[PDB]
Enzyme design. Structure first.
Site, short mmCIF file in Angstrom:
data_model
loop_
_atom_site.label_atom_id
_atom_site.label_comp_id
_atom_site.label_asym_id
_atom_site.label_seq_id
_atom_site.Cartn_x
_atom_site.Cartn_y
_atom_site.Cartn_z
N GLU A 1 4.74 27.77 -61.98
CA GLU A 1 3.58 26.99 -62.42
C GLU A 1 3.76 25.47 -62.38
OE1 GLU A 1 2.57 29.19 -66.14
OE2 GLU A 1 0.97 30.05 -64.91
N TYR B 1 10.16 20.86 -72.87
CA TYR B 1 11.36 21.66 -72.54
C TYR B 1 12.28 20.81 -71.69
N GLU B 2 13.53 20.84 -71.91
CA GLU B 2 14.56 20.50 -70.86
C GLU B 2 15.48 21.67 -70.55
OE1 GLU B 2 13.47 17.74 -72.52
OE2 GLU B 2 13.43 16.24 -70.92
N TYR B 3 15.67 21.92 -69.26
CA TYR B 3 16.56 22.98 -68.82
C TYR B 3 17.64 22.34 -67.97
CZ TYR B 3 12.80 26.20 -70.20
OH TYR B 3 11.87 26.94 -70.90
N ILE C 1 19.33 44.51 -49.49
CA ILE C 1 18.66 44.63 -50.79
C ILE C 1 18.47 43.26 -51.42
CG2 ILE C 1 19.61 46.97 -51.17
CD1 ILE C 1 21.63 45.74 -53.12
N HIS D 1 12.71 32.63 -73.84
CA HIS D 1 12.86 31.98 -72.54
C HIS D 1 13.51 33.02 -71.65
CE1 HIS D 1 12.57 27.77 -74.20
NE2 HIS D 1 13.06 28.38 -75.26
N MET E 1 9.79 19.12 -61.20
CA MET E 1 10.01 18.63 -62.57
C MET E 1 11.43 18.11 -62.77
SD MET E 1 7.05 18.94 -63.83
CE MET E 1 5.73 19.36 -62.70
N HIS F 1 9.24 32.13 -79.59
CA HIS F 1 9.03 32.33 -78.14
C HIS F 1 10.32 32.85 -77.55
CE1 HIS F 1 10.49 28.30 -78.94
NE2 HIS F 1 11.12 28.36 -77.78
N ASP G 1 7.56 28.64 -65.78
CA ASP G 1 7.84 27.23 -65.45
C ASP G 1 8.12 27.00 -63.99
OD1 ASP G 1 7.51 25.84 -68.01
OD2 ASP G 1 9.30 26.93 -68.62
CU LIG Z 1 13.05 27.82 -77.20
XE LIG Z 2 5.18 23.95 -69.93
#
Ligand SMILES: [Cu+2]
Ligand SMILES: [Xe]
Ligand SMILES: [Cu+2]
Ligand SMILES: [Xe]
Ligand SMILES: [Xe]
Ligand SMILES: [Xe]
Ligand SMILES: [Xe]
Ligand SMILES: [Xe]
Ligand SMILES: [Xe]
Ligand SMILES: [Xe]
Lengths: 656, 657
Positions: free
Chosen positions: A306, A389-391, A598, A442, A312, A440, A303
């Site tokens: 891409e 999706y919401e994050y 590092i 995440h 977003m 899936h 996400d």
């Molecule tokens: Cu999920």
């Molecule tokens: Xe997506």
């Protein structure tokens, strides 16, 4: 020239974005170009630290751009020196494809709605030709498809049907998947399944109040309010993008890709300002689906690389997303025409009560002798939406000197169609009639550029272990002995480690050049993180190849400039073959990472097996990790905070 | 005559019932010199309770369980009092066990050691003059287990410290020796003296009150601007006695001397269908095993719940300080040694708090103008208990998605032992201050769940994320991405003995195999999501492993039987760990059925603590959490009928033009 920013790490202003795109348009005069990315090129680490701490040169103010040119493959990228309004570096990359912008996501629907082949498939699926305005799509990057590689810029249109514009479309996926050339604005192929499944005839699974009244009879009454006020203002102080709060000082940055970027993080230890991190941010994600059936292997969105956590990002509604007294920041990007665009209130900053910081009472006087101090936390947050999706992302600073990243996953399940007699298991769940929500994960890559108490750092795995001496031995008579085994990483290969429940593994980032005067141990921040799923996709899989970072919980590599994005600079349609990103940085694994500059990349996240509770809209699912000072301070750093209540033994006695 | 009957069979004993119980017991043992250790509700049998609540069944008898000591007699006597008839109905003598230590028991030891000639001698040898014994303090732990005395005497070990001033925090100044005290005879019977002597630290005390901090760092931070929390129209929850109703949840809030908070008869009102979830949930035992092998530190492995009690040790919560906002408080009532009721005021706090976002979704098509956001509220039922140096803040949290969470914050002070000037604390501890060794330890907890997921007849399973067994490039897994959840249903007790596994992101389901979700086709379940699941580091056959049989596995599932509460046995102090009692008895040979029956699910969770100077002289809160989430219980998100904080549809966004 555009006005110089208050601070070298400040994001490009709208004026700088426009100055940059004018510069690039002039350089490519007579060519038909469009803008994909116009963003700050951050100063080199050495350059920045020299400027900030050593009276060193002012780093050049630079813009990095990515453009496309009509009729040319791939992209061109380069740097603009804003002070001289000139292109200083340029290159053509004919075999890569770049991040998809909001404009790119919005363009696909009218392409598929007007394509004869897509119309035909809709009709075969039970939707009349004159109802194409009811067909919607989430136009993901194709991700990777071995039929086209990077030779064309491609999206895959995951198609859905709405009976009414206000429906949530996800109860009504269609069975086929058009492939769209983003730049040519045409459908080039349609993936059609061997077994056809027509559009669901069920009611849409909806979630607005009007829908719920129909579905369950009524909304719950409005609950009585919980009001949060700060009548005397806040304790934090912002000077431009620089935050000062509870002895922490840091710069809040933002970009199209990572979203929030926290830089130049220090802690003022009673007048001694001690560096902790140079930069911390989320640097990539991957959300790999677990159905092996074609074409679902192409569902593994990275996400961040891409689509972009900045591009977003949601404009945060006042004051519903964030409760209390808030300081907001706006985000500025370029659109395809090279004009600046703004997302208002992209970042929210506020302080909140966080329960108890510490407490102790003495049993001797029935706990009359007592001290309690309440905690406050500082939260820097954004929410981004990647199609379904919401994050919700929360960077949290705490009064014990710890820093936490909290994520809440919400939004809607990605769904595919399910036949009346079709079993969704083992790869997905039937969450609603004719709806298959596939398994899936995440996964997220946290990128830490540490400077723990200064430069010259190392990292280690810490494993709790029983003593190797047996029960009944002079060394371990009662068999209770245990210790923490520290494995300091000497070379990159040593660092490639996973979370281990068997040892309650944590990781230290520490300064081997310094010693705690009490404990004799180096000052460190310890990564405490247990939501560390293995990568379920097999070695050599498309997912494992495109996300080399995701195969281990921890990857530590030498610092070099421009080592930001561990799946490469241009992620869409890369096959995962080649020495780039984390694969390049790891190299043969032999480079030194002990007592040097590092970069510590940590893979964390969740594995999601959908259930009906998640549908039609998913309750928030939490993910968290923390970086805690251990042996950094010589005592609890919060003890000079005024207690909420304190009574000493003598005071308790004289209270008779 | 008889005490008034409670509003509800699970209500704790009132002060009047406690006094009625102790009068009854004193009468039964008239002419004997007895003291009271425990006087608590004996909860109705599960079957009896459910039959009463749901089937118009018999009213369960109101019963008090007591534990007493008698002067000159070993061990304890225990039994039951029928409160309605003021009679003892069951009794037995247990000559070879020792019971939980009360606050009175902890407070009594200092006077004993300060006046003991042998202890005074050891203080003088340690650099403290004989006339300064008022400056010597001790935390008088149970001895835990010492093979020199077994359960033949009731014993404490006095962990000794020095204060230069009464307002000092003593933990910077441990002494090197350990007096052993007979709790009932009030005498020192032995002193553990180390081979290498270490005299008292000459350093300043490591202190933490404002007056101390002003001296140490120059000044306190200015008072921060207030963050005020108000509920001007009141709260959304409703309490009817001890019964809570909030956001469709209904449950009974109980409390006792040992477990502290006990949540019972938990259901969820699913649009008029009241669905049971748990019959009872609580913390049932703990163990806090230390990791120094040196003598006598093997005796540091407090089972805080069974040995001191999360009720007995609970803090009276100070108004507006421990708990912020609009609070409903409950008081706790116990018996003292004389059989008189004692009260801890404001032992439990109940309140609702904002909990950020519950859910959100916006449509990219109109730049997120189409949007719905709903904020979350949580209900918190909380207590804080203090075991000598330790503070455990316990928060039972109910959420609007139907989940239930347990959050714990550890604070208080490190247990410390003395460290010589040239002595290395590693690998078993950390030098957190000059001459102070804070030993490694774990804190482990046994969560006891008596489920009734959507009704009676439950099973449990481990759930493991697994890649498809088919290789990359196979027709079944062409691109190597396929994965699934492997469910292993426990058929017999032995099957259930399972640990958390990071390799599979293991969770556990408690489910009803008699029912089916109409959408997914899976049984309704609550899933245990818990990753703070340390292995027990003490070796098989160790004192720690023997005294806490439950701690060796993350999950233990056994058949339900009445009075299967406490997994290290009913009387924990000084038990060697040898014998078929507690969890060891309940597991048996591991062959009993646990599929589709009445089960008890015991979960071991907690942390491993390697001290650092940040933890001293007072430790910042360290969090522990676990959650039980409905999965396949509902047919859709149960919170969708909560009014959004903001909602705009696509059509509405277009009408804004
Ligand atoms: Cu999920
Ligand atoms: Xe997506
Ligand atoms: Cu601890
Ligand atoms: Xe998308
Ligand atoms: Xe609505
Ligand atoms: Xe973090
Ligand atoms: Xe104690
Ligand atoms: Xe003070
Ligand atoms: Xe204790
Ligand atoms: Xe819980």
């Amino acid at each position: 020239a555009p006005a110089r920013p208050a601070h070298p790490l400040d994001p490009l202003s709208t004026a700088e974005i426009k100055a940059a795109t004018n510069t690039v348009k002039s350089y490519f005069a007579g060519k038909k170009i469009s803008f994909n990315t116009v963003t700050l090129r951050e100063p080199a680490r050495k350059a920045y630290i020299q400027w900030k701490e050593q009276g060193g040169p002012l780093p050049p103010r630079l813009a990095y751009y990515v453009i496309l040119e009509a009729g040319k493959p791939g992209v061109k990228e380069g740097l603009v020196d804003l002070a001289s309004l000139s292109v200083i570096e340029t290159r053509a990359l004919e075999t890569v494809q770049p991040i998809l912008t909001v404009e790119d996501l919005c363009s696909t629907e009218e392409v598929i709605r007007n394509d004869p082949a897509v119309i035909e498939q809709c009709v075969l699926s039970g939707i009349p030709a004159n109802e194409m305005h009811k067909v919607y799509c989430d136009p993901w990057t194709i991700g990777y498809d071995e039929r086209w590689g990077t030779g064309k810029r491609l999206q895959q249109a995951l198609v859905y049907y709405r009976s009414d514009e206000d429906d949530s479309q996800y109860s009504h996926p269609l069975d086929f998947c058009p492939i769209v050339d983003t730049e040519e604005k045409k459908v080039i192929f349609i993936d059609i399944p061997n077994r056809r499944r027509k559009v669901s005839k069920h009611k849409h699974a909806n979630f607005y109040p009007k829908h719920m009244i129909e579905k369950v009879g009524a909304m719950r009454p409005e609950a009585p309010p919980i009001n949060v006020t700060q009548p005397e203002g806040v304790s934090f102080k912002m000077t431009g993008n620089v935050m000062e709060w509870s002895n922490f000082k840091f710069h809040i940055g933002f970009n199209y890709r990572e979203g929030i970027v926290l830089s130049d993080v220090s802690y003022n230890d009673h007048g001694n300002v001690r560096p902790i991190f140079h930069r911390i941010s989320l640097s990539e994600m991957i959300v790999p689906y677990g159905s092996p059936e074609f074409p679902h292997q192409r569902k593994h969105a990275l996400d961040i690389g891409e689509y972009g956590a900045g591009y977003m990002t949601n404009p945060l509604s006042l004051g519903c997303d964030c409760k209390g007294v808030i300081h907001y920041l706006d985000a500025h990007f370029s659109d395809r025409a090279g004009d600046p665009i703004t997302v208002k209130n992209a970042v929210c900053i506020h302080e909140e009560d966080d329960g108890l910081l510490f407490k102790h009472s003495d049993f001797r006087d029935n706990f009359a002798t007592s001290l309690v101090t309440r905690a406050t936390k500082l939260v820097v947050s954004q929410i981004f939406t990647a199609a379904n999706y919401e994050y919700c992302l929360y960077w949290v600073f705490m009064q014990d000197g710890a820093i936490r990243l909290d994520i809440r996953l919400t939004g809607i399940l990605n769904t595919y169609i399910l036949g009346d007699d079709e079993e969704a298991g083992p790869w997905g769940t039937r969450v609603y009639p004719n709806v298959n929500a596939h398994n899936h994960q995440h996964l997220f890559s946290l990128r830490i550029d540490p400077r723990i108490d200064g430069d010259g750092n190392s990292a280690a795995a810490c494993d709790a272990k029983s003593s190797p001496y047996p029960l009944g031995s002079p060394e371990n008579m009662y068999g209770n002995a245990f210790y923490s085994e520290k494995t300091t990483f000497k070379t990159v290969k040593d660092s490639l480690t996973n979370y281990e429940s068997a040892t309650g593994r944590s990781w230290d980032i520490f300064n081997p050049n310094k010693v705690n005067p009490y404990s004799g141990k180096p000052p460190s921040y310890k990564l405490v993180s247990t939501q560390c799923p293995p990568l379920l996709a097999k070695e050599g899989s498309l997912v494992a190849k495109r996300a080399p970072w995701a195969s281990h919980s921890v990857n530590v590599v030498p610092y070099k400039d421009n080592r930001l994005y561990p799946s490469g600079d241009h992620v869409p349609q890369w096959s995962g073959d080649g020495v780039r990103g984390m694969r390049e940085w790891i190299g043969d694994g032999s480079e030194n990472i002990d007592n040097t500059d590092i970069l510590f990349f940590h893979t964390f996240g969740i594995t999601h097996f959908p259930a009906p509770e998640d549908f039609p809209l998913m309750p928030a699912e939490p993910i968290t990790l923390m970086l805690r000072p251990r042996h950094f301070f010589t005592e609890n750093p919060g003890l000079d905070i005024q207690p909420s209540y304190a009574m000493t033994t003598s005071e308790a006695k004289r209270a008779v």
